[PDB]
Design a protein around this ligand. Structure first.
Ligand SMILES: [Fe+3]
Ligand SMILES: [Fe+3]
Ligand SMILES: [Fe+3]
Ligand SMILES: [Fe+3]
Ligand SMILES: [Fe+3]
Ligand SMILES: [Fe+3]
Ligand SMILES: [Fe+3]
Ligand SMILES: [Fe+3]
Ligand SMILES: [Fe+3]
Ligand SMILES: [Fe+3]
Ligand SMILES: [Fe+3]
Ligand SMILES: [Fe+3]
Lengths: 144, 144, 144, 144, 144, 144, 144, 144, 144, 144, 144, 144
């Protein structure tokens, strides 16, 4: 894809993930409650920021960002969670799965943005990669 | 409807509105840019909070909150905006329209919650009513 | 009862609960220690505030608040905990039991204060109800 | 009266009281000086806020707030203080008298706003009632 | 006039202006709303401070400050605004008119205080002159 | 007594004193109201902290802290106040009496903890002694 | 005197007054204790600053500031207080007496500095005059 | 050019732009005044920082930064503005023109620094590019 | 000269000095580095503020401030420094020389502004004089 | 040993423990991850401070602190951990073991410093003892 | 001496030292100016606190603190500095001399307070000893 | 080497340097004391952070970080300092030597990480390079 197309897909995943971790946030069960309730909030706050940055990068690039939830679920590569009750372990396995998926997408973003000579989208991609890789480590350590 | 059903519809509108004012936030054109770009951010921050409060009130009430964007666009009473370029005036007319709609919904919430004896949902509804009514005044003054 | 009588009973429970969660605070055992030690502190800080608000509302109402620990254990509906060692689970079951009891009492407070036309005691009662209901949800989610 | 008429009278009293406690603020005499000089400042800061809230509630309600000092002294139920020297005791007796008067007015506001179905003016009235009742207690305790 | 007489007239204008910019604050109409609503608040906050400083300078000088709204409208040189709806432009023209008037008064204050050897009233007058002159520039630039 | 026995008695007095100064806090009468209402709050906040520190020192020492209000009134050396109305002077005489009593107890604590080689309980005791002695001076100066 | 000579005398009074209000600070007796203990601290903090500013102005002026307590008691016009116990009233009468004395000295400073063309010492003098005159008013109101 | 030569030219433009936006800052006319007066201040604060960073990067690189205004106007590629009165629109068109020019220069900087293996100058260039591109978008949206 | 002409010359010196101390800031050599690097930054921050205040005072006065670096080097009385390496001592001698020059200019400003009756420019001049005289003392002490 | 010799051994253990809890910090596995990752950071921050305080106390005492990692592993009484993966339980058992060891060492420090008349090293030792004893309690409660 | 007599002598030295380091503060000459000017300020701020603590400890002990500068120079063991110009080195040698003297006095204080059983004066003495010993090290390192 | 091998060597140098600058921190002698004592603290705080970041990057990369001081001195390229007394100049020469060494290592890290496609390790390396190059400049300027 072109850089802006990768950006729009990533933007779609951000809003879908924002909704998804809210689900984990509200419906966690178990003696783990306080910690995951607290952690998921920080996570969706981050997706809200990513959602906004991706969209603004797209307009700076001269293109159209997704502007409706309808376009978003049409472009996501993230499956929506319909369940309404979870335990810590399952929540972290899913978040880990989605994080690994985002990491691949940001690597593509970084690679194709570089070929186009898009210096600033590349550094944006590399910064998100850094955050994702640190969290993936922590998620994996937690599940070990 | 029952209190929790009104809450779920309101929750649906919150996430749809969150997306909608982001659109206004990114695509404003005109010498008004900085102000509306700044204002819309405060507004969607508020919808993000409302979205979370509504959902948690629903689980406290023993019911299921919407957990997917798909359920959300199925329950909204808010029309999604597909346009990608706006001028201050049109943005504020739409926001005003949606605010007036939310005010009616929160009045129903307050009324039916009261009949059920749901004291805390009533005060929540009345607090949102207060914020909505102050903003509606400001929106109308702006368009005068 | 009359509003001030409900207030005095609630005041009695506040100081008894203040002592009770201190017990949980000092005597928790288990890998859960840090979290419950931290949580119980926030909880008894809250009871200390409730204890003071209830008492001052009573004097504003023209009556006498409980002024001795002796009157307090004579008026409580809360059983004192004599054990000196606990595990997370048992602590949260007890706190949940006591919270549910307080919720019923604050509902009575709200109801009878309303019949007397006591507008401000009603809003006080409804605010405490809101906090109690949110915590009851979290306590229950934790024990699930 | 209608809700907005009660609001305008209350608005009139707020600006008149704002001026009145400034008088006490500047002209206190006695070893009590620092405390009452400090207390009266907090009090008129509060009236300035009340003055603004009442007025904005009136415009939100679709009516006209008082916009001149002339209309204000025409609508007050508060007598203006012409003396320019006071001692702690007399200052607190007057403030107490005026507070008791405001409490009756806010009770009417709450009652008539409720009959009209004005949910948000009712909660505003009840919140002011709470503050007034706490201060009335303290004023009375001080004069005992 | 004598220094204290100029001070009392200025004190009268301060409370009248405090009321006047509140009117502009509540009744602005137009796409300018947020800015002037915000600006007028800062302005009346300033008049509230000026009102208090003038009055306290008068008592320090051994005289009586105005203590009633009635004395105030009897001493002002500022005309009260009876209209209840305005647009940015008209609001700023009026504020500018009143600021220019205050500047002349503070120049007289500074001049006559100096002849009396009143060192501290002179520096107070000169400081207000500085603030007034900066705002007059900004008001004029705005209307250009 | 043994160090932990002195600690438990002190813990008992802390909760009893916490209740006692709340009484003074709510029921002060007189032109002194604001100051003593404010001072008593700081004092019971301190007893709440002392109550918690004493108890935790006891568990660190391998013993059982008091965990019920019932055990507390069985171990106190502090008489509970049944009156519900006081004037500044009487409040400070009582607080002074109780402070002098606590000072003797902390001196014993310091002395016997030292004989046992309990270095940290000794420094805790000496720190409380410092605070008590400064307050006793201020209380006495106030009553002079 | 010459400006620097007035400055040195003022510097002498500052350190003597710093010591004097410490005496009032430590030895106040009476139900007024907390307030005057608190007020005197703010006052000597101010004298410490004045002491430093006066001295640095003298070196900026090319002269020698007092550098010993011995030179200070040789140059003061302030009588040292040998008593070690006071009541609020006597403390404020003395402070008032000394403040009135400082005001005369700062007026001379302002006058002679002006004749010499010393612009910055004049504004320093006038600023201190402002603070002194406000406090003198408050001291006098307190003693009325 | 060599990296340090591009850096010196950029440094020259920074100080020239610092002066230029001050002009816009002082001489804006129109109902837009407050906003552009505020915005231009943030902009020249940024140029002051850029000016300092560029210069220090040059010395770190072992070369000489421009040290006089004379060398600066000899090296700029930015035309100085001699007019002394402007309206919002013209100010933003000029700033936009200059920003687009800076963006091209920072792209060259990034490109040539990379060929030389200058890792840190490249990241500096890319960070400035990011800020410039976001502002260019906002400037363009404003002028649309 | 007329007040505004003195102001424009001072404005010219401010921007030239801003550039000059940046030179000292970047090119200091010696074990003194950290201190002078830190000090020079505070100094040019001050000149940036002075530059802005002078210019705005000129427009408030109804005249034109310098708006180009070209006009600035045409009006300065300050010689630009072309050297690119310095040691602490030489830097402070130059800064001292320039400060003494600014002091003379601000004295003229104060004197001629006074003759014109320009009260606020006089206090501005006297405030800068105060800062300059304190720094001149410190600079001289440093070089002694 | 002599006081300074005990101090050097303690200093050696501090840097070794600093490294050891970093290991636990990076290599924790399990659903406990976030908590122990967070806790271990606070712990090694503390050892870094202890390391610095011990060393500076030694130089104040006129002796040489350890200045190389080589001297440190030669003087420690703490065994280094070579494993690179742990679970909460094992981490806390080790930390507990090392804390108990440090407590014995600080008791010796306190005892021998006292015999030498080293007042300040004694209070330092007693303060560390206090922190260690509180943590040992919490560690033990956690493992129960 | 008795504890209170040692305290009074120490109190005398505190005010004399407060004056002495002010002298160093104002009259330092040399490229060291900024650092010692800054350091001496922190030092006399400390003596001001020590002066107040010593005095209040004396009244808590039931004795009379020095209340005049005259009593102070009669009790000091510190020689007053009459010179008005110094260089870094001489300032630090003197401060070091006086610090070593204070250390001996605080050791006596600690020793005799202990024999009297004065627990809190002992900890006060030991805390000052700690601060003095750290500064003595730094002073000596500086002079090496 | 492979990226993780370079990371482990860098991690080894970080802990060795952390110890080394502590030595400079404790043992500086000379009138430079305060500045270098303060500077070295900021430096070792930085190495502590670098030590932690390097180690966590290694685990994120799927490898083992150094977990013992023993492995560290086996892998460093940094020579340990055995001396216990230094003067400013020697301290800065050593730090400069070590910084230049770290810069070469981070350049290798950046280069080899890039060949492996390790985007985030590259940006980490480039950021450290930026900090190192700025400090190297300052160190060199200081020694000039
Ligand atoms: Fe945004
Ligand atoms: Fe939430
Ligand atoms: Fe209270
Ligand atoms: Fe308002
Ligand atoms: Fe006031
Ligand atoms: Fe605790
Ligand atoms: Fe100073
Ligand atoms: Fe810089
Ligand atoms: Fe400006
Ligand atoms: Fe240190
Ligand atoms: Fe004190
Ligand atoms: Fe870490």
């Amino acid at each position: 894809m072109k850089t802006f197309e990768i950006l729009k897909h990533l933007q779609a995943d951000a809003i879908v993930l924002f909704m998804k971790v809210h689900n984990f946030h509200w419906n966690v069960k178990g003696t783990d409650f306080f910690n995951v309730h607290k952690a998921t909030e920080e996570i969706y706050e981050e997706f809200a920021d990513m959602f906004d940055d991706l969209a603004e990068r797209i307009v700076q690039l001269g293109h159209h960002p997704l502007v409706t939830l309808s376009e978003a679920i049409k472009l996501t590569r993230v499956k929506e969670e319909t369940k309404t009750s979870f335990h810590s372990k399952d929540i972290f396995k899913e978040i880990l799965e989605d994080y690994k998926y985002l990491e691949k997408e940001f690597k593509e973003l970084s690679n194709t943005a570089e070929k186009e000579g898009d210096k600033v989208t590349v550094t944006y991609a590399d910064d998100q990669l850094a955050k994702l890789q640190k969290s993936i480590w922590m998620l994996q350590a937690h599940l070990a």
